[PDB]
Amino acid sequence: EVIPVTEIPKFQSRAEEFFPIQWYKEMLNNSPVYFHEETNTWNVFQYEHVKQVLSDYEFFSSDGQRTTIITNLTNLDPPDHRKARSLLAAAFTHRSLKNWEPRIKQIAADLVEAIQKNPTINIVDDLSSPFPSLVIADLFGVPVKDRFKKWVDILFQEKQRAGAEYFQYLYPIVIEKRSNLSDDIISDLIQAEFDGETFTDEEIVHATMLLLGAGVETTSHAIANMFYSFLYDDKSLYSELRNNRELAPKAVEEMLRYRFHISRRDRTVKQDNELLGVKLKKGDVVIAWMSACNMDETMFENPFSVDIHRPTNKKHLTFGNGPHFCLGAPLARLEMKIILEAFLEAFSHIEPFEDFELEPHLTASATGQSLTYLPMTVYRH
Numbered sequence: 549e550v551i552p553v554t555e556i557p558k559f560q561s562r563a564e565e566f567f568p569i570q571w572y573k574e575m576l577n578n579s580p581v582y583f584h585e586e587t588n589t590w591n592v593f594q595y596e597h598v599k600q601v602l603s604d605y606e607f608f609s610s611d612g613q614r615t616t617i618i619t620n621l622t623n624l625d626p627p628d629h630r631k632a633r634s635l636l637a638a639a640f641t642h643r644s645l646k647n648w649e650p651r652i653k654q655i656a657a658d659l660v661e662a663i664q665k666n667p668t669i670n671i672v673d674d675l676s677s678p679f680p681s682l683v684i685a686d687l688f689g690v691p692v693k694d695r696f697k698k699w700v701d702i703l704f705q706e707k708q709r710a711g712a713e714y715f716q717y718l719y720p721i722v723i724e725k726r727s728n729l730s731d732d733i734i735s736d737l738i739q740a741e742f743d744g745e746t747f748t749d750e751e752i753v754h755a756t757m758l759l760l761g762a763g764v765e766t767t768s769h770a771i772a773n774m775f776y777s778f779l780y781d782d783k784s785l786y787s788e789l790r791n792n793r794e795l796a797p798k799a800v801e802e803m804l805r806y807r808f809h810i811s812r813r814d815r816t817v818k819q820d821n822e823l824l825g826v827k828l829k830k831g832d833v834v835i836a837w838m839s840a841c842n843m844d845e846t847m848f849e850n851p852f853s854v855d856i857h858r859p860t861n862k863k864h865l866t867f868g869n870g871p872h873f874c875l876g877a878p879l880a881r882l883e884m885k886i887i888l889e890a891f892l893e894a895f896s897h898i899e900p901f902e903d904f905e906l907e908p909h910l911t912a913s914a915t916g917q918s919l920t921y922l923p924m925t926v927y928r929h
């Protein structure tokens with residue numbers, strides 16, 4: 549049973565759903581452990597409850613009958629999760645993340661080089677939408693000619709057709725790489741082994757589709773919302789980053805705490821318990837609202853303000869917590885750092901369009917509402 553999580557807050561505007569800080573403050577102050585009769589869900593907003601739901605799989609299972617949304621990795625609890633996680637993790641080593649940085653830098657340099665003389669840019673079409681698709685295509689090892697945005701657009705049934713077309717495209721590339729191994733994700737998934745078990749070629753195609761669904765639109769949203777913040781939240785932050793070019797990672801971590809909305813994951817209660825202060829029964833569904841708990845003043849001082857120097861920022865739960873903690877988190881942080889650093893090198897100052905209207909430039913997405921357009925005036929020094 550697909551649970552329509554959109555019906556819990558019932559937002560009055562796309563703009564509110566895009567940045568629901570008023571609703572987070574209401575739930576944290578008045579209703580932090582909230583039973584929603586219409587969806588038959590429990591809803592938790594406080595940092596210590598959200599963290600417990602995400603990680604304590606003995607009590608809060610990822611593999612229940614009801615959900616908020618090809619290996620089903622995200623739907624497995626330990627012990628069955630260990631093999632799937634280990635085989636996919638073979639493509640996300642410390643060595644690969646080190647080797648990816650100069651490749652991702654090249655891609656960012658080319659995207660920014662295309663807009664370097666622009667008086668005005670559109671973050672979405674010029675940067676946030678193409679960049680994570682161009683990156684994942686390079687990291688997969690796709691032929692240079694195919695270097696792909698189309699796929700994830702369509703991968704959003706339209707869905708049956710698109711998945712069958714991706715499969716026919718990639719299946720012969722995996723077979724080819726099995727005989728012709730290179731430093732790319734597909735080659736690392738071919739060589740992966742757990743207790744003598746390996747992926748089949750078909751499983752590797754599915755693994756790449758899971759990585760596309762996990763890592764493209766999420767990263768696009770995170771980048772667009774970071775640039776949104778520089779225009780609309782702390783308008784002095786961009787200047788601070790220009791003045792000290794080592795601050796990019798701190799800025800990325802604060803934009804993942806402050807401007808990624810809405811982050812929520814569901815679990816199914818596995819055993820009766822009152823760990824969240826209320827009696828729950830086996831089969832109950834709990835939604836953990838990570839974006840809300842990222843503004844819990846018990847963990848984050850001055851939580852409704854941008855502060856890239858807040859020493860707790862690295863504790864945000866935008867990537868989850870526990871066994872399912874985002875496999876892509878290092879890559880996501882690297883992509884956001886590299887695109888921000890390339891942008892800072894090109895542009896001395898950015899300004900919003902006085903006439904930009906948010907409501908007409910938001911569309912429904914898996915995370916709530918996403919920018920369709922984000923204009924800015926840019927300057928060079």
Ligand code: HEM
Nearest residue numbers: 621622762763766767770813866867868872874875876880
């Ligand atoms: C800003 C970007 C991203 C965000 C906000 C994000 C968020 C998340 C979250 C919250 C989970 C945990 C789900 C849960 O507990 O139920 C997760 C899992 C995962 N993410 Fe990410 N993600 C991002 C980028 C990426 C990228 C770039 C990749 C890969 C290229 C990726 C691959 C995955 C995978 C494979 C899992 C499943 C791990 C498991 O279930 O063991 N993600 N992501």
